[PDB]
Amino acid sequence: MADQLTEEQIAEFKEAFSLFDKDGDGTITTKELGTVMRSLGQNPTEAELQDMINEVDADGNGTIDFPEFLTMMARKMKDTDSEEEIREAFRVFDKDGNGYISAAELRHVMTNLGEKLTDEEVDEMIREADIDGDGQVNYEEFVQMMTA
Amino acid sequence: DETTALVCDNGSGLVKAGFAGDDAPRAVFPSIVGRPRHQGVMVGMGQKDSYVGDEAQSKRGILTLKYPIEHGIITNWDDMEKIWHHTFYNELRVAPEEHPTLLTEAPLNPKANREKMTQIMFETFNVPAMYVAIQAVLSLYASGRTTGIVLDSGDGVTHNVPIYEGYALPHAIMRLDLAGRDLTDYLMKILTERGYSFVTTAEREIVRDIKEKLCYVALDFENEMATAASSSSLEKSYELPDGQVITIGNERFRCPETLFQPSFIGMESAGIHETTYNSIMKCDIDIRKDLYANNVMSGGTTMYPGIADRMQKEITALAPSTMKIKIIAPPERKYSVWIGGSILASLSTFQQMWITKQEYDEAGPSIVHRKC
Amino acid sequence: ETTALVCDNGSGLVKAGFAGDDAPRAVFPSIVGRPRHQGVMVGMGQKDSYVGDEAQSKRGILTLKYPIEHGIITNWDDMEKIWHHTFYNELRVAPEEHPTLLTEAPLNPKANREKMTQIMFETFNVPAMYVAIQAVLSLYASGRTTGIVLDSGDGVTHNVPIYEGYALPHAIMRLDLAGRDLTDYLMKILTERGYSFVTTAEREIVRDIKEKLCYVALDFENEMATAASSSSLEKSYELPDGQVITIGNERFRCPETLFQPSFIGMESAGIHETTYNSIMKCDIDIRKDLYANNVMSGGTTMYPGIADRMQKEITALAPSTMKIKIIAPPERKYSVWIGGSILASLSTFQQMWITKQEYDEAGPSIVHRKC
Amino acid sequence: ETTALVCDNGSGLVKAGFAGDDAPRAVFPSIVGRPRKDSYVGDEAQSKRGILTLKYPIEHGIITNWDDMEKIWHHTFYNELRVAPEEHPTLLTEAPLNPKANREKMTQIMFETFNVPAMYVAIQAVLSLYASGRTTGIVLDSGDGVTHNVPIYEGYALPHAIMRLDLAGRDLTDYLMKILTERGYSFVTTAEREIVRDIKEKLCYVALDFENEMATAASSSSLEKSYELPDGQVITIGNERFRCPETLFQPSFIGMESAGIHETTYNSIMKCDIDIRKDLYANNVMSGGTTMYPGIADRMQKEITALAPSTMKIKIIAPPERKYSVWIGGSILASLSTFQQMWITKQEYDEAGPSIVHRKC
Amino acid sequence: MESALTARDRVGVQDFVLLENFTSEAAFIENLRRRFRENLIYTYIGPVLVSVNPYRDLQIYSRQHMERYRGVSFYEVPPHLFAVADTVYRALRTERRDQAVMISGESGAGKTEATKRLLQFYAETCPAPERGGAVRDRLLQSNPVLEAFGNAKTLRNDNSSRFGKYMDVQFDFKGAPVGGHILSYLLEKSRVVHQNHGERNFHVFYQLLEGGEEETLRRLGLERNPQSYLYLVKGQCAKVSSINDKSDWKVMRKALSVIDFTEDEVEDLLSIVASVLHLGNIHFAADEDSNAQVTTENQLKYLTRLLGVEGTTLREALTHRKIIAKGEELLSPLNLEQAAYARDALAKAVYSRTFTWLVRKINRSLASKDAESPSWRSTTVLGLLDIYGFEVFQHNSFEQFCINYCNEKLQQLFIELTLKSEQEEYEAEGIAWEPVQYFNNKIICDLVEEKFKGIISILDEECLRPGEATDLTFLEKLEDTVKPHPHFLTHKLADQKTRKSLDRGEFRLLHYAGEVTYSVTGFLDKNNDLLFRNLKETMCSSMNPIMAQCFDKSELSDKKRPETVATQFKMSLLQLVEILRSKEPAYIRCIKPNDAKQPGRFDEVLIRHQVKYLGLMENLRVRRAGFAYRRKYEAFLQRYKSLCPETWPMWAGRPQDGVAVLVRHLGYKPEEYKMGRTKIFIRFPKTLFATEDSLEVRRQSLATKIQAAWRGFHWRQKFL
Numbered sequence A: 001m002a003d004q005l006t007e008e009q010i011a012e013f014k015e016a017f018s019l020f021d022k023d024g025d026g027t028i029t030t031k032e033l034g035t036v037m038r039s040l041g042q043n044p045t046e047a048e049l050q051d052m053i054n055e056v057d058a059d060g061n062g063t064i065d066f067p068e069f070l071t072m073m074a075r076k077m078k079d080t081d082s083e084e085e086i087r088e089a090f091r092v093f094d095k096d097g098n099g100y101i102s103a104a105e106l107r108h109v110m111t112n113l114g115e116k117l118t119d120e121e122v123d124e125m126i127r128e129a130d131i132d133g134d135g136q137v138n139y140e141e142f143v144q145m146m147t148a
Numbered sequence B: 001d002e003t004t005a006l007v008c009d010n011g012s013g014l015v016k017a018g019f020a021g022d023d024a025p026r027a028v029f030p031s032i033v034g035r036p037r038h039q040g041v042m043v044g045m046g047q048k049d050s051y052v053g054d055e056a057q058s059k060r061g062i063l064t065l066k067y068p069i070e071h072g073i074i075t076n077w078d079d080m081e082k083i084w085h086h087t088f089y090n091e092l093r094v095a096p097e098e099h100p101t102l103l104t105e106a107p108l109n110p111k112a113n114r115e116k117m118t119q120i121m122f123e124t125f126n127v128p129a130m131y132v133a134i135q136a137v138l139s140l141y142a143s144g145r146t147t148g149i150v151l152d153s154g155d156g157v158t159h160n161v162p163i164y165e166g167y168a169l170p171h172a173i174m175r176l177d178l179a180g181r182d183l184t185d186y187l188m189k190i191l192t193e194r195g196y197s198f199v200t201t202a203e204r205e206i207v208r209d210i211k212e213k214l215c216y217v218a219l220d221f222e223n224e225m226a227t228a229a230s231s232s233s234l235e236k237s238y239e240l241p242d243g244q245v246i247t248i249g250n251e252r253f254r255c256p257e258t259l260f261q262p263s264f265i266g267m268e269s270a271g272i273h274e275t276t277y278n279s280i281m282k283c284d285i286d287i288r289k290d291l292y293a294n295n296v297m298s299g300g301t302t303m304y305p306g307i308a309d310r311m312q313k314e315i316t317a318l319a320p321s322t323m324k325i326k327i328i329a330p331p332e333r334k335y336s337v338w339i340g341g342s343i344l345a346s347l348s349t350f351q352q353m354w355i356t357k358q359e360y361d362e363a364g365p366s367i368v369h370r371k372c
Numbered sequence C: 001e002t003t004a005l006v007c008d009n010g011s012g013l014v015k016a017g018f019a020g021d022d023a024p025r026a027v028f029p030s031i032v033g034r035p036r037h038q039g040v041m042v043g044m045g046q047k048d049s050y051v052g053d054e055a056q057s058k059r060g061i062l063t064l065k066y067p068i069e070h071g072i073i074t075n076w077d078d079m080e081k082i083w084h085h086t087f088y089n090e091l092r093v094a095p096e097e098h099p100t101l102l103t104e105a106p107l108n109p110k111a112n113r114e115k116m117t118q119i120m121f122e123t124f125n126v127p128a129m130y131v132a133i134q135a136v137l138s139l140y141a142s143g144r145t146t147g148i149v150l151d152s153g154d155g156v157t158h159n160v161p162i163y164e165g166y167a168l169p170h171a172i173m174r175l176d177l178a179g180r181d182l183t184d185y186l187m188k189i190l191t192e193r194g195y196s197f198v199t200t201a202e203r204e205i206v207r208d209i210k211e212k213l214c215y216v217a218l219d220f221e222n223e224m225a226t227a228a229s230s231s232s233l234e235k236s237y238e239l240p241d242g243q244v245i246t247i248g249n250e251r252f253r254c255p256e257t258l259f260q261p262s263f264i265g266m267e268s269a270g271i272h273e274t275t276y277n278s279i280m281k282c283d284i285d286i287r288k289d290l291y292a293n294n295v296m297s298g299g300t301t302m303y304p305g306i307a308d309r310m311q312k313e314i315t316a317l318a319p320s321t322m323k324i325k326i327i328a329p330p331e332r333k334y335s336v337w338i339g340g341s342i343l344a345s346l347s348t349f350q351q352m353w354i355t356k357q358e359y360d361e362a363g364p365s366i367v368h369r370k371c
Numbered sequence D: 001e002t003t004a005l006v007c008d009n010g011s012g013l014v015k016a017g018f019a020g021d022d023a024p025r026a027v028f029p030s031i032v033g034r035p036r037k038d039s040y041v042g043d044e045a046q047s048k049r050g051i052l053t054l055k056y057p058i059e060h061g062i063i064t065n066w067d068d069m070e071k072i073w074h075h076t077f078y079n080e081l082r083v084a085p086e087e088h089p090t091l092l093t094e095a096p097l098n099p100k101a102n103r104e105k106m107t108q109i110m111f112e113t114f115n116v117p118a119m120y121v122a123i124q125a126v127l128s129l130y131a132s133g134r135t136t137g138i139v140l141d142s143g144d145g146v147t148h149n150v151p152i153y154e155g156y157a158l159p160h161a162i163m164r165l166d167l168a169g170r171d172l173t174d175y176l177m178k179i180l181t182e183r184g185y186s187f188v189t190t191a192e193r194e195i196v197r198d199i200k201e202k203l204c205y206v207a208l209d210f211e212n213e214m215a216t217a218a219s220s221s222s223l224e225k226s227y228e229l230p231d232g233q234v235i236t237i238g239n240e241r242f243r244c245p246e247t248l249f250q251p252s253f254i255g256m257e258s259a260g261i262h263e264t265t266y267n268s269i270m271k272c273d274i275d276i277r278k279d280l281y282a283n284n285v286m287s288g289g290t291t292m293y294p295g296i297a298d299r300m301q302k303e304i305t306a307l308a309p310s311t312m313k314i315k316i317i318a319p320p321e322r323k324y325s326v327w328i329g330g331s332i333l334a335s336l337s338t339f340q341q342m343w344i345t346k347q348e349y350d351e352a353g354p355s356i357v358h359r360k361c
Numbered sequence E: 001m002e003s004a005l006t007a008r009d010r011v012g013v014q015d016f017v018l019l020e021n022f023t024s025e026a027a028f029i030e031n032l033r034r035r036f037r038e039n040l041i042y043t044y045i046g047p048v049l050v051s052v053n054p055y056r057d058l059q060i061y062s063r064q065h066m067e068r069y070r071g072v073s074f075y076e077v078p079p080h081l082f083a084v085a086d087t088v089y090r091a092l093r094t095e096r097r098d099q100a101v102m103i104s105g106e107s108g109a110g111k112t113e114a115t116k117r118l119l120q121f122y123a124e125t126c127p128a129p130e131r132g133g134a135v136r137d138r139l140l141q142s143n144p145v146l147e148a149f150g151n152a153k154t155l156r157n158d159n160s161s162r163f164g165k166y167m168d169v170q171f172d173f174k175g176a177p178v179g180g181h182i183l184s185y186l187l188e189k190s191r192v193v194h195q196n197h198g199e200r201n202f203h204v205f206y207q208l209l210e211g212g213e214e215e216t217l218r219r220l221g222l223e224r225n226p227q228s229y230l231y232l233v234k235g236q237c238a239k240v241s242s243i244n245d246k247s248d249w250k251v252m253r254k255a256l257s258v259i260d261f262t263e264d265e266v267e268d269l270l271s272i273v274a275s276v277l278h279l280g281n282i283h284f285a286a287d288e289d290s291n292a293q294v295t296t297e298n299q300l301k302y303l304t305r306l307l308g309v310e311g312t313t314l315r316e317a318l319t320h321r322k323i324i325a326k327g328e329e330l331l332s333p334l335n336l337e338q339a340a341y342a343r344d345a346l347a348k349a350v351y352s353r354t355f356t357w358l359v360r361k362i363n364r365s366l367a368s369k370d371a372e373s374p375s376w377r378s379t380t381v382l383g384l385l386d387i388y389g390f391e392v393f394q395h396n397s398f399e400q401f402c403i404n405y406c407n408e409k410l411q412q413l414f415i416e417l418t419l420k421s422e423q424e425e426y427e428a429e430g431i432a433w434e435p436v437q438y439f440n441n442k443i444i445c446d447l448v449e450e451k452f453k454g455i456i457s458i459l460d461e462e463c464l465r466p467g468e469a470t471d472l473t474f475l476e477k478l479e480d481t482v483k484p485h486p487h488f489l490t491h492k493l494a495d496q497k498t499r500k501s502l503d504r505g506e507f508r509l510l511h512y513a514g515e516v517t518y519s520v521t522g523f524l525d526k527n528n529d530l531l532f533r534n535l536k537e538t539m540c541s542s543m544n545p546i547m548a549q550c551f552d553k554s555e556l557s558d559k560k561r562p563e564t565v566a567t568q569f570k571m572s573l574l575q576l577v578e579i580l581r582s583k584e585p586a587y588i589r590c591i592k593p594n595d596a597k598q599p600g601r602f603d604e605v606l607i608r609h610q611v612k613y614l615g616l617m618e619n620l621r622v623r624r625a626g627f628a629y630r631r632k633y634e635a636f637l638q639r640y641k642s643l644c645p646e647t648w649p650m651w652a653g654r655p656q657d658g659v660a661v662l663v664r665h666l667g668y669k670p671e672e673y674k675m676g677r678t679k680i681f682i683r684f685p686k687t688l689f690a691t692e693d694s695l696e697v698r699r700q701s702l703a704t705k706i707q708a709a710w711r712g713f714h715w716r717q718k719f720l
């Protein structure tokens, strides 16, 4: 409908998918669909992934094929969540509106709220959100780094 | 004369005197003793230390004037002796020991007043026989009635005595120490509102002569007050003795209205109309009707124009409307007590009722409490 | 509180308090005074009218009136002022809390009870009230079931004969002469000495002369002889302005009017004949029992020598063998009150009071069925 | 602003000021001088008195000369109090039994010459109770032109027991102008009345027993006193020092018939009803300038103790501020919160004319 | 701020205009209890701070909190004393009109702490902190000196301030604290000469008698027992266990030293306090003219040594009224009533003047050493005002009647200013004034003060009227002249049902704080202040340096009669009001949560009385106006733009039109909101709480998008 994949894009997606295949079975784990999509620079939510996986988990087996991976890829390519929406979303968690968020306040909301970072993923986020080590992230700069 | 009865109505403002059998008194004189204020200088004059009656009142300018009687009480017995002496020696011209003398008194008087009148009449004037009438009973003898209620109004006393069929009713007798002298002392106060400062005992007699000539009783007091407050036609001029023309307005009917409203003079007592009705409705089992039919007016403050029509109107508003309230005001009502005493002392039947000089030797001055 | 009020309203003084008291808490003159004169000092806070001891203090500026004359209420506006002052100023209690015993004289107009009843329920809102005849209360103040009571107040004198709790109502006799008619005669006979009293404020001075100086002559024609022939009976009274009165036979010519109402101009016989004709109008074998039991009450029975003259005079009319006694208790000025406090504490009369429920059912004519 | 004016015009001195004050601001003689400016008023006239015919517009409490009384009100407001009268309601004083034209024409002149917003006229002896702090008593006010008695009980006047005597300080000046000629001292002109008034105000006293002071002065010179006149001639006075104040106790010395100030007081107490009298005997107030003699409250107590019954206690209230007490009582009255309802307004004067004072006051 | 509204179930609403049932006082006291349990002692009613005393050293006043509240607008932060402090300072630096802060409350409600801590924020943060700290210490070390002379024990508390204390800090054009000022208003000077039962006189007298060298008292009346003196003992309360008068004196004597009184100035001042004791012990008798004369010489033997006046002149002044007319001076003698009133007027006047002189002596020690005069650039004052609370006891009297009239007049002013402050914003934003009805304070001030019919003008007449005069005759005139009024009642005017609650010899006023019943007994004795010119003319001649400065020769020119205490109080109060109408007031209102002085105990039976005495419900009624909330469209849109698809992440144009699409997505009904010139208005807090509760669920999607973007970025960082 909105767009159709070019043979070169299908080749890049197949090349990345080959790292998750590795052994030559040509199929990827139901949760690992998110990892190949994220390797391909997509920003899917766990709710989006599960809501698509519900259409292909129906026979069991625990894995999905290349054609249905390529279909779920083409579904999320309609509406990847963009820089200005992500920046303004951080602006709702900023308590002053000053353009900075503390490592503690980010650690709070990222563990408390929907789809939750685990503490390992929060420390990995803080490791490069706290860019010069003063304990604050400039979210307006961090979003332009993150959405490139 | 042999022994014609003297009749001496020594009233509180005028001595009225004569002999029984005459139509009216021979002597009528102001009841005043006067003594000079300023010292004498014209050494060739036969100047008297005192003047009485006309001798004092024609000289009022140079004298301080005193009445012996106030409210029917003889307050000064020496000024009294000087006035009876003047009556017998100068005015009637007879020896008092040669004539039996009727005296008059207001009711409810102090008892030492009858006793001292008695004592002086024997131990000074040596009168052969004496009796002390009550003035309101004399105005019935004068009226030719056995039955009536008499309003007698003098210089010093107003009183109501109901007599029915020859019987007086001593519970129903009303006395009001408000009459012609109280009305004169209040006209002296009214006339200050136009600045006329009458203040001497001589000028009291000028204000009395205004009261006798221009004052009258309003038939409706608030209607005449509204008439005098909105027209000139009620005003009268009066010429004082030196030639100053005074003017009197509402001041002329506001003075007599004090008989109907004693509160003007500061008294608590009721008017003469209520004091009449409050005496008729003090009367016994049968009589109340025949006293409403015989209201007899007597003595000088019953002389005002409009007083009979006012009394008839004011009692008609208190009394039961089936009654005939009829008020008896003969033209002679200023001498009615004297004319009355001239009838009484002439009566063939009265002649045993005198205190005789002999009876005053058998019992003291208390004899008048037994004989009258 | 729930205790009954009692109000002995009688002609001269109001008396009021609670049932079960010994004596009235309020005792004050039944007068309303209104200003006679020009009010002149601004800011004074002068009242439109004064009641009781306020009017009896300020006398010289007031025209005094009593609403009760001869035991009959002649002015209801002034009487409502007296009752409002009684509850609100003297007793300091809301009438809506307390059942009220009122008193009045025998042979009064029936209108006087109806209008008392109406004012107690419609103007003062009492829960219940009663009217009681004063000389009944004075009998039962004495701790007696049998006796004849002479009850000379300020405005009426009645005799009521009562035999073992039954009044004999045909032998009730009322005389419209008492202490106010004696003050008015004393005003008349004081003018014979030359003193003049004419204002209502002076009537209250002459009343005070009468209460302090007057006494009853054990033989009038012998005290008349002793007063006509000596200075031994004369006494003096100092007026408010310090003038000194002196009086002699005027001291006993005034009280003698109780024995000779012809001095005041009435035909009816003295209190001794009025008593005796009440005893003789009773049944032949209850007379012996009333002669032994003449109670006296109200203030016009308070003169020195009155019980002795009354005992002399009924002994002169009664059979030679009769034991006359006259019961003149020292407190006889309050016996109508003391009776009213007792015959309202009784448990047996708590069902006798007229309730406001029975007033709503019948209007003011309820008193004639009940009392 | 809008405080009230209080103004006691009485006979000899004007006393004037505002209702808030302790005592008056304007106190000057009620005089117009004319040449013997076309006229001079008050302290200006009394200072220039050699060249002047000094006329007083009030005689015996009556205004006799309305054109000269307008000059005294003009000098009162515009020179002494120094205010526009249009801003201030005005309390005037008056004597009891005065003519009705005197009130009418006071009222007309306040509303139609001075445009005053509201006014009242009060009786002087009534005002002199407020200064005394009392609502029961008989007040002997005695100024320059009038002596009067008003009896009051519980704040009600007894108007039938009011007494007025047309004899006060000016009749005493004019009698001291008679009895001083017996020493060969001549005082005839209007300016010489002021010199003889200033003698009366310094050398006179009320004798406690006149016939014994007469014998004392006849015996010896110890009662004689001296007064230097404004040209340095010396007047010596003796028997004449108590003869003059005796004319209040003996109005026969001046040819009047009236009873003395002691009997005129007793005769008011006897016009009052018996109950009131004991309280009037304890509350004889005195006010105005002829009550100021040394010995006058002592003589008044001695003379009323001989008339009143011996069981009464007689007390005579004679404050040091007697002279200003009428005005001081006017200051209290015009200050009362209850009184502000009682002023005659110009709006009521438009409905009722000068007659309104007889309804309101 | 809306961030707290998600916690509104435990942490309460921050500003009471958001409490939904705003007319329910039980909800107001519940939101106070809800916060105080949570240690959140500060809450607003719009700009007005409501505070409740923690009885704990909460750490919230430290320097790290001050700079949190510095230069930040007061509703973008939680409520604190420092949010009022900063706002009052910024208004001074920027409008350059003078500013005030009314600290208000019960005695013991924490008013001292608010004043001490405000004077900490203006010291520890302003651009001359060394002079600022000196002015703080000179402002605060004056406390024992003013507290000894102006506090007294009452039935309600042991140490209650009987005067309106005022304290400025004075600032130059640079915002440097240059100096200070002190003033003192409306002192209860009746307390010098009459106390109610269970109440003492001002603290200095018992301090002086209980604590003092024998050689210090031996120069004075030296009897140590306070019952010896008629002015100390009328309340029967002289000895009390809670007040260590011996220790309080030793502190105050050192405070006078440290405040720079030289030793002779204290000896003068103790001699004035002892002169006030001896004035109470003078006994008059009447001679046979009913005129008062001093019988007892031992008081006058010391009053000449201590007041420094001539004994023959003090005897005359206490017994004669001097009048001056036509240039003569007339000594009219006093009766026993007037001579007692003269003695007590002199004690009230000597004491209220040595107190006004202590306040001048202190104020002249706070003023700047610099010339402060043109062409000096500018100077501006920031003040603290600390006048007494509304006062209801078992038996209310003339002092309470004045204190409550004062608080009525200050409530009247405050509600007029609050109503004006709302209405000016409704006109500015173009919203119709939906008309609130609120308790009209005008009617009850007109009842007390109206020129020739108010209670004070009737009471002023009862002191001036001739004849015998009584408190009951005064009441009988109130009952005739006030009569039909809706806020006035007496036992006579009461219906039979209400007449059970109200005695004879009492009247009742309906005040903003409910009904208060005043016993009239003592009104006339307390309202008389007969200080005759003769007494001032004596006192201005004194050898004592204080009395010479207190009674100046120029005052003797005034020809008016002595004004009554209620009239002096009315006049002085209306001067305090014009000082507060001209100045810009902030308000702090303090609540005492229990009478035990205890942590954590919240006693609603006590707090209901204070919330009523502070008028907080009437202020909430007026401040709430027609709409619970209003906010600028920029601030409202940048918050809630995430709810409506069109406004997210950025709106297409003018913010007012962005809100006009956003509130349509939120489905606000036409009466739930209004659209002013630059603010949205919301009528009920229902709508706002639902919108912040929509934002609270929307945070789940906003956080999800951030985490999805991170988990995408994570692979491209960690590999290839």
Ligand SMILES: Nc1ncnc2c1ncn2[C@@H]1O[C@H](COP(=O)(O)OP(=O)(O)O)[C@@H](O)[C@H]1O
Pocket: B010, B011, B012, B013, B014, B015, B031, B153, B154, B155, B156, B157, B179, B180, B181, B208, B211, B212, B213, B299, B300, B301, B303, B304, B334
């Ligand atoms: N024509 C009159 N009109 C009004 N008053 C009159 C008249 N004639 C007399 N009087 C008054 O009546 C009084 C005299 O009445 P009189 O009966 O002679 O008095 P009394 O008997 O007491 O001496 C005086 O006061 C007098 O002025």
Ligand SMILES: Nc1ncnc2c1ncn2[C@@H]1O[C@H](COP(=O)(O)OP(=O)(O)O)[C@@H](O)[C@H]1O
Pocket: D008, D009, D010, D011, D012, D013, D014, D142, D143, D144, D145, D146, D168, D169, D170, D197, D200, D201, D202, D287, D288, D289, D290, D292, D293, D323
């Ligand atoms: N000390 C005094 N001794 C005697 N007479 C005095 C004294 N002082 C004033 N007077 C007299 O008092 C009169 C003025 O009294 P005042 O009260 O002012 O009366 P008025 O208001 O009518 O002018 C004058 O006749 C004056 O001479």
Ligand SMILES: [Mg+2]
Pocket: B011, B012, B135, B153, B154, B155, B299, B300, B337
């Ligand atoms: Mg005659």
Ligand SMILES: [Mg+2]
Pocket: C008, C009, C010, C011, C012, C013, C014, C015, C030, C153, C154
């Ligand atoms: Mg009785």
Ligand SMILES: [Mg+2]
Pocket: D008, D009, D010, D011, D012, D013, D014, D015, D030, D143, D144
């Ligand atoms: Mg004068």
